[PDB]
From a paper:
Here, we show that a group of class A/rhodopsin-like orphan GPCRs including GPR61, GPR161 and [name] increase the cAMP level similarly to fully activated D1 dopamine receptor (D1R). We report cryo-electron microscopy structures of the GPR61‒Gs, GPR161‒Gs and [name]‒Gs complexes without any exogenous ligands. In this work, we show that the high constitutive activity of [name] can be attributed to endogenous [name], which occupies the OBP of [name], whereas penetration of ECL2 in the OBP of GPR61 and GPR161 possibly contributes to the high constitutive activity. Here, we found a group of class A Gs-coupled oGPCRs named caoGPCRs show extremely high basal activity, compared with the other oGPCRs.
Author numbering:
A (entry chain B): 12 to 61, 207 to 254, 265 to 394
B (entry chain E): 1 to 128
C (entry chain A): 15 to 157, 167 to 304
D (entry chain C): 3 to 340
E (entry chain D): 8 to 62
The structure:
Amino acid sequence: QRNEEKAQREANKKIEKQLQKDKQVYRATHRLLLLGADNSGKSTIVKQMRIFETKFQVDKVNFHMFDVGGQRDERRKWIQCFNDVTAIIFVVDSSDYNRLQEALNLFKSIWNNRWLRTISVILFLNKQDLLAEKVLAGKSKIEDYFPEFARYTTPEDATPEPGEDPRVTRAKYFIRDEFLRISTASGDGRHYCYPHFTCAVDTENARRIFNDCRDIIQRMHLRQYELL
Amino acid sequence: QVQLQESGGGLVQPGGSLRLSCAASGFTFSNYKMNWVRQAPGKGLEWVSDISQSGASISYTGSVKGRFTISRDNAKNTLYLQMNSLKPEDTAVYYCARCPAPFTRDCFDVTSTTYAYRGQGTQVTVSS
Amino acid sequence: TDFRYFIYAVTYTVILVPGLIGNILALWVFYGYMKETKRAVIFMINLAIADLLQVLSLPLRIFYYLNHDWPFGPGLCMFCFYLKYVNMYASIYFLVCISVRRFWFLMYPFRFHDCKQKYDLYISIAGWLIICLACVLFPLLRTKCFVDLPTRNVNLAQSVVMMTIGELIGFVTPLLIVLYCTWKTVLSLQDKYPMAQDLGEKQKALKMILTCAGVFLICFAPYHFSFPLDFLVKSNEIKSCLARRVILIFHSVALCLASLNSCLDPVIYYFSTNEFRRRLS
Amino acid sequence: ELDQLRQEAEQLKNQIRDARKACADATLSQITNNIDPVGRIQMRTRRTLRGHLAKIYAMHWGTDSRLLVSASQDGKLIIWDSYTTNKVHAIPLRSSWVMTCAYAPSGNYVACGGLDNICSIYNLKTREGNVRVSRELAGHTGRLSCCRFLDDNQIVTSSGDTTCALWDIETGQQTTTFTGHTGDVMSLSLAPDTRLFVSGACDASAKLWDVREGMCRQTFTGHESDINAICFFPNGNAFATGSDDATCRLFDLRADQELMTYSHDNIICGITSVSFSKSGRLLLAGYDDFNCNVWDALKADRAGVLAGHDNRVSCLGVTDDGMAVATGSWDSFLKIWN
Amino acid sequence: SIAQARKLVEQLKMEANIDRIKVSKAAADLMAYCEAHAKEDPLLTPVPASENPFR
Ligand SMILES: CCCCCCCCCCCCCCC(O)OC[C@@H](O)COP(=O)(O)OC[C@H](N)C(=O)O
Ligand SMILES: CC(C)CCC[C@@H](C)[C@H]1CC[C@H]2[C@@H]3CC=C4C[C@@H](O)CC[C@]4(C)[C@H]3CC[C@]12C
Ligand SMILES: CC(C)CCC[C@@H](C)[C@H]1CC[C@H]2[C@@H]3CC=C4C[C@@H](O)CC[C@]4(C)[C@H]3CC[C@]12C
């Protein structure tokens, strides 16, 4: 009776000690959900940041990102699983105009999901070099796939790279604004989208993810500890 | 059983007109966002149009925007796609895709191999 | 005491009702926040309690200043004299604690988490005790209910040393800590590189932080500048009649400002918050 | 031949529907209208088993009706003693994303699985003290959504690759493959005799399978959206399924059609977990609205509400002895009711 | 896709070839099971707290 109950209590004490240690380790790392499609350099982002999971560390903060690629095309049930992550890192190839609508639909589905309406999305418009080549060549027209691009003017807050053709900047910010329209249509202020223009040879995406996650955590702290 | 039957389609010269009708059975039509999804030969599924529960929020793919019209008749439990100003690039098998869950603004229904709640589809060929 | 009565009476009458209403409503919303949310609001609970205790200290002062006589006995009068100062310094302490916590979870977010809010109750009662013991000094030096009591005849050197120590700690340490934390928090909330285009909450929080430090610095600075001068005047160290009169008037205005802060902490700290504006609605 | 096969399938479906309608002489609700309702059911949180760091997806009561095992997204499989609220075991998992857990009838083994596509069997009764990963079962190409032990050597696992698998643990290879679902299989329940089992899938259809034959014995199509929960009636001749269209539905194996629908106008959130009481009179369902419901399985009238969770209720369990009902939610809490 | 259609037709034939019973009989069996075991259901009938290991 009591003899076995004392042993059970001691075992529970050891379990809770190990569980507190695991809680300290667990809360100190941030989970990111990597999403994208084929021909989008999510794998290139992972490898340039040094499979299913990749671990990186910036400013003594540990992130580990999950690239779920072992399942079928349907996403509903295993996207329900990634609702506690700090950020969803959505990588989209800006060059491919054919799949831009598919990526917009996927972004809208992620944004409007009941269990993903709180996670902020870090949007990486990858493959900007190929998009610039397509825009400069002129063989492929964005207005063919997006007619409203024919009525689009570059935003006044745009920050083009020095020595860049304004057509390329217009295309970049058009795609970014298409994603941000979905972002702000039903954001409700609870989550936000953080667009970035990245390329294959970019070597600073980890810092962008770090800053975006720090902003997300600051906003979360502001939201929760309003009464302190 | 969730059944979606598509009617219409066929061979049409470029610039013609078509009406794709979609009879839905086995579920409450008014509670689900509906989609029209086409698969062109030699390529995978492509989302064409969608319309919300009450028909207030319709949205279109930019390729077919300005030519195709999407509508619902929740009384008759039917989905309409008025296809106007057809092009040779618009030849495809057309499908009705019901969004997986009711009262949701998100949809995952362009599954390349098998989607649970997609119709059989009808061929729409545009050539001379 | 003439002018002072008029001044203290009107200011305390103006402050009593808003302090009561705001602080009791804030405590009710705290109980609601506990029943609805598992988070802890210990620091703001202590701040509201201290402000409410100050407000409940006012009415007997109002009665004395209106009637010029004290029929309730010396013990109650001395306790009421002790109350206002003890919970005023409690308010200062918990404003500092709130500022430090906001600095912690807005300047080092990751490090913050939420189990990093674990020794809060000890931080709260450590304060409510040290203050009450430091404020044991208040009745002893003034051993006629609130303003007409003669100060204890004590040596100028020891009095000056003790007064400097008390002023230094209980004002400079809160002031320096609050100013530094507000500066760092404002620096953190300001996005230099472009970030997500929010609805404006990162700027509303900036305005709230700046408004708090400011009300602190203006309700509490004049009191602690005029406090050594008032103590010197009441100890007869200063002999200039005009200087004594202006010092007394300035000290009266300064305590008026301090009680005004006691009744203004509700508004700024609580009713500007979205959670209050949603719970009442 | 494709058109001929489609026409033949349509005719077969039509005549199956006609036969089922012919068998539908009367409704279950009409026959059960005479009996008096159970009235309000009062249930309360006896134990609040806490210690999980993240959401719980699956739990499973032991046959001893005292020990339970829960799986959490933090990569932890905690075996609690419900009576004393003492965590008997806490197994770390190689894959943090675990969506299923099972506890063997013998009590010597537990099962784990999820996005790793692998069913990890852990041996609790180890000579060398702490638990160790007994074996790993691979061969499924979609996440593992639910696991159920036939015995200490056979386990039936449903996967999001539209299949189920009967594994012999000793050999480690997939003994039998059950195929025919056209969507992710999200739940399965074993019959009391462990001879048949019903699996609910994302194609809004449940399937009754025979474990020895390996072929689909029956298919039930009465729902509108994905099926997330399923469980046999205690007699084994019926089963209730929960779906995303905020409806629970009761099917009978011999009747081969839906018998009764448990739904309300005020309920729009989808089901996540269903279970029956020991007698089967009460059907307990978990919802997305953070609260569990307790329906009268015979009269389709709600009899109770278990509102004690601050997040989505993800797993339900009923003791074999019938003492208690455990609800595990996404607020990292598992609670006991009776 | 011919194999998928053939398999679906075969499965439909198998599901059709079975023998069904009346829904009245199924309802009667469910009622009989519910009433026979109603005594041994602590959820259905709250057992006194002295017999609850949790209370
Ligand atoms: C924990 C840190 C504590 C910080 C320091 C606290 C103790 C500091 C005490 C040092 C000297 C105290 C001198 C006592 C003294 O002079 O009384 C305080 C004065 O403000 C009295 O105010 P008085 O001008 O008489 O008017 C009274 C006023 N109407 C009233 O309502 O209190
Ligand atoms: C006249 C003066 C001395 C009264 C002093 C009262 C002080 C010591 C008492 C009164 C109210 C008490 C507080 C009441 C409320 C709370 C919030 C609770 O979550 C933690 C305890 C805490 C923080 C108490 C701390 C001690 C406390 C502040
Ligand atoms: C009126 C006077 C006495 C107020 C005194 C203010 C200063 C001395 C007090 C008030 C609030 C206190 C802080 C409250 C919060 C913390 C977090 C704790 O984990 C470490 C100590 C620390 C940093 C305390 C340091 C001392 C502190 C800053």
